[PDB]
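Morning!

As promised:
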Amino acid sequence: ELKHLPKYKHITEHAETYANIDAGSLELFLSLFDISKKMNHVMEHYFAGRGLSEGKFKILMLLFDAKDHRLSPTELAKRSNVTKATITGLLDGLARDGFVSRRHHRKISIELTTEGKARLEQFLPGHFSKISAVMENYSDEEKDMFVKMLGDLFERLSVFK
Amino acid sequence: ELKHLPKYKHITEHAETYANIDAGSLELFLSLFDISKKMNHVMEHYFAGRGLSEGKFKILMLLFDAKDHRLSPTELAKRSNVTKATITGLLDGLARDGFVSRRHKISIELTTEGKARLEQFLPGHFSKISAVMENYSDEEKDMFVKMLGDLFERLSVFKD
């Protein structure tokens, strides 16, 4: 996408004329929107580079974290941000791809295969190093303040319906 | 799509057991990714409600602020942070939608419907943004925008 974060000098000076609107708030909102487009853009291709999706990788990460690498499908739906009908389609693919296996023991459980666990252990180190690279040179109290602000922004965005 | 930003400290503090990853760094990154998916979602439908996009709306902005509401397409590419190949596609849509007109060194102009549609939309669009940043001080926001700058460039490393 883009290389460096764009400032929107034109839009900023224009909204200052409007009654209840300050400059900085606009720059902060537009930056947050820029990073969002690149966030989502870069991420969709990264997981593509590995034959995956946002959803399928979050499922794989749920299992890798579960005791015995087993979780019910409904539990996987709850633990991600999607409905049961959705994870059913993903689970179908992951099963076909051989990453995951659907087992009974009545109610059904979903378990990581040995190849799926193996392929995951070959990928995760680079994935964590890249994330580490992004938050480099940020202090501890800084990271917390950032997420605390992302907390407020997320909920107020509903008023942006 | 979701109600509140998901909290990750529990999953995160467990990831220090996984690998060489810090708590805040992982939590921040996951938070940034959740907010990102949300904003792309909400904003896509919001501008859909008005027949626009982020891209088309940013052009109308440029036009609305220019003297005589006229700007060359090349100036629009430079000022919107988008490439000429892209702005040509946006411009085409706006032209068909009736927001803009191409006149003769070529010129892009707001139609009167476009200016009207813009003047009726901008006040509500600005109050919602202000509301989103209720009680943040100058030094808070300037740090927040500062941090957003470094993350913006470093996301390039997710080129696998």
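Chain A touches chain B through 73 residues (CB under 8 Å).

Hope this helps with the figure draft.
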